[PDB]
Design a protein around this ligand. Structure first.
Ligand SMILES: O=c1ccn([C@H]2C[C@H](O)[C@@H](COP(=O)(O)NP(=O)(O)OP(=O)(O)O)O2)c(=O)[nH]1
Ligand SMILES: O=c1ccn([C@H]2C[C@H](O)[C@@H](COP(=O)(O)NP(=O)(O)OP(=O)(O)O)O2)c(=O)[nH]1
Ligand SMILES: O=c1ccn([C@H]2C[C@H](O)[C@@H](COP(=O)(O)NP(=O)(O)OP(=O)(O)O)O2)c(=O)[nH]1
Ligand code: NI
Ligand code: NI
Lengths: 155, 155, 155
C-alpha cells in the first residue's frame, strides 16, 4: 500500500536508496559505464523497473551536485503509473564542441581523472561509471480529470 | 468538478488526449508549422486554453521521445491556476551552430525529411508541423501557505 | 501549520512574494549582482532559507519570461523538506561562445544595457542584478513509501 515495487533487471543494477527520512527522492544509480563527448546525447540504463500506482507520477530528475558542477544536463523523465520497463536517463553533455583535446576526461564531480595509460579525449568529455549517483526519483500525486471542450470558461 | 475546462482558440488547435488511463499527462499538439535553426529560440502556439482550478499547478512539459531523439529542448512551463491565455511552448533548438549546411532538415523523430525541391538549410535544423505531439500537460496539487518571516526556525 | 517559515540570511535578501492568490509559486529574488559570459555556469545566492515540512518538496524553478527571452537556463532545484541552508539558483548562460564581442551586455529582459563607460563584453553576456525576479518557488506534496525488492510485479 504504502510501499513501492522495485525490480532489478540485471546484476549491474543497484537498489534505490532514501537514506534520510528528510530526503524527498530516491538515489538512482547507473548500470552503465559510458563516456560522453561534448554535445553528445544518450539514454543511460539503470536496469531498474518501478510499478507506480495510479494517481501518481514519477519524476526521474537530476541531482543538484552533478548538474551544478558538470555540463551533464538531465531532462526530467515523467514515469507513468503502470510503466514496467527499464528506467532510462535522458542525458546530454552540454559542453560545447570547441575542437580542442585533452589527455584526461572528468568525473561527475568535475574532477580530472588521472589514467595510467595516456589517451586523447576531446575537451569537456565526461565519464559516468557503474554504480554512481547521477539521478534521483521523486513521486508526486496527480489530478487527471475528464476533458470537456468549452466555448467560454465558467467565470 | 473532476473535469477540466479546455478552450480551442482557432481551427488549427487540436483537443488534448489522454488515450490511456495509465498515462499521467495530456498530449499537447502544435498549432504551428515552424523551422528551428541551431541555437534558435521560439514560443510555439498551441491555440489552446485551460482553466486549472485553485490548489493545482499545470506542468506543460516535454515528451521523452522527442527530447531524447532531437536537440529540441522544452523548458517546462508552470501553468498558473486561473491563466486563461494561449498555452505556449517554450522551446530551443540546442543543436550547436557549426556553420555547416545540409539539403534536408529533420523531424521530431530526428529522421531526415526528403523534399521534392532542393533547399539549403543549416545543419541541425528541425521542423515542427501542425498537429504534432511535441509536449504534454501534467497537473499537480500545490501547497500555498502564508509566509512568516522568522529569525530562527522552529526546531 | 498552513504557514511556511522563511529566514533572511543577509541585508541583500528579499522576502518572497505571492502577490496573487491566483499564482502557484513564490517570487525569488537574487541577492547578488553577477555577469554571466556565454557557456558560463554559476550558483546564484538568494540569501534565503526555507523550512519545508515533511511530506512536501520545493521546486526552485525558472520564470517563463526570463527563460523564453534570454539564454539563461535554470536547472530546477528540488528543495528537501528539512534543508535549512542558503537557497541557490543553479544557472547557466546557454548562449554559445562565438568569440565575438560587443560594447554592452543585456538584462533578464534581453534588452541592451547602455553604459556611461565603454566596456568590451563577449557577445551573449547577461547581467543579473540585486533584487531581481529571476526564479520562483513551488511546493508540491510527495509520496515516499518504503521500497520492497520484487522479482515480478503484482499484476
Ligand atoms: O538549485 C538548487 C538545488 C538544490 N538546492 C538545495 C536544496 C536541497 O535540499 C539540497 C540538495 O539538492 P537536491 O535535493 O536538488 N539533490 P541531492 O539531495 O541529491 O543533493 P546533491 O545533488 O548535492 O547530492 O540543495 C538549492 O538550494 N538550490
Ligand atoms: O528519462 C526517461 C523518460 C521516460 N521514461 C519512461 C517512463 C515513461 O512511462 C515512459 C514514457 O515517457 P514520458 O511519460 O516521459 N513521455 P510520453 O508518455 O509522451 O512517451 P513518448 O515521449 O515516448 O511519446 O518512458 C524513462 O524511463 N526515462
Ligand atoms: O511555456 C509556458 C510557460 C508559461 N505559460 C503561461 C502559463 C502561466 O500561467 C503564465 C506565467 O508563466 P509562469 O507561471 O511559468 N512564470 P511567471 O508566473 O513568473 O510569469 P513570468 O515568467 O512571465 O513573470 O504563462 C505558457 O503558456 N507556456
Ligand atoms: Ni520539473
Ligand atoms: Ni547548449
Amino acid at each position: 500500500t504504502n510501499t513501492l515495487q522495485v525490480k532489478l533487471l540485471s546484476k549491474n543494477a543497484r537498489m534505490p536508496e532514501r537514506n534520510h527520512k528528510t530526503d524527498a527522492g530516491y538515489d538512482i544509480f547507473s548500470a552503465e559505464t559510458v563516456v560522453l563527448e561534448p554535445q553528445e546525447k544518450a539514454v543511460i540504463k539503470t536496469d531498474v523497473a518501478v510499478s507506480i500506482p495510479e494517481g501518481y507520477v514519477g519524476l526521474l530528475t537530476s541531482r543538484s551536485g552533478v548538474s551544478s558542477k558538470t555540463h551533464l544536463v538531465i531532462e526530467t523523465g515523467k514515469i507513468n503509473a503502470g510503466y514496467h520497463g527499464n528506467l532510462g536517463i535522458n542525458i546530454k553533455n552540454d559542453h560545447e564542441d570547441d575542437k580542442m583535446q585533452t589527455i584526461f576526461l572528468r568525473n561527475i564531480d568535475n574532477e580530472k581523472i588521472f589514467e595510467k595509460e595516456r589517451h586523447l579525449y576531446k575537451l569537456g568529455s565526461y565519464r559516468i561509471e557503474k554504480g554512481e549517483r547521477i539521478a534521483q526519483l521523486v513521486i508526486v500525486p496527480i489530478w487527471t480529470p475528464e476533458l470537456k471542450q468549452v466555448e467560454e470558461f465558467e467565470s
